[PDB]
């Protein structure tokens, strides 16, 4: 298992632009388009996105694509932020994969506002850091992804993706 594939699973993939849990305008492997509610914005974004007259669909190479920019963003995102780097840093392979989860989902910003299980995860204490990250609109509102990504920070294994 990997980011790509754990990410894969968490967001689906959908080659028409569709709205997401909060109902903005996304495309492929949670692509989101834009926050605005129009689908004619939304196919504006889409086309400058890959470059080309789209018309709301795309293919599988190019969801491929912006899925690849996306992981890659969000990593080097994380490897910018004062308060995320240091966590990072400091985590095991499969739970630096989790961080990354969350930053893709949440953007870095909203991550790092995460102050109390940031430190919590930096200290190690696994079950106190899931006590906490559940006290939180993201738990509250996509219960069953974020219950997948905290027993992943709580484990440091796989396991709720098998
Ligand atoms: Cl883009
Ligand atoms: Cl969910």
Redesign the pocket.
């Given at each position: 298992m990997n980011i790509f594939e754990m990410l894969r699973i968490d967001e689906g993939l959908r080659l028409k632009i569709y709205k997401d849990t909060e109902g903005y305008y996304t495309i492929g492997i949670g692509?989101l388009l834009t926050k605005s509610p129009s689908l004619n914005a939304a196919k504006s974004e889409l086309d400058?996105?890959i470059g080309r007259n789209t018309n709301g669909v795309i293919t599988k190479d190019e969801a491929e694509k912006?899925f690849n920019?996306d992981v890659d963003a969000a990593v080097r995102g994380i490897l910018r932020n004062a308060k995320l780097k240091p966590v990072y840093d400091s985590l095991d392979a499969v739970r630096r994969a989790a961080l990354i989860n969350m930053v893709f989902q949440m953007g870095e910003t909203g991550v790092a506002g995460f102050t109390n299980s940031l430190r919590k995860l930096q200290q190690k204490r696994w079950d106190e850091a899931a006590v906490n990250l559940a006290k939180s609109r993201w738990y509250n509102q996509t219960p069953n992804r974020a219950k997948r990504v905290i027993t992943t920070f709580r484990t440091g294994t796989w396991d709720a993706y098998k």
């Open positions: 692509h400058k996105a912006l920019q």
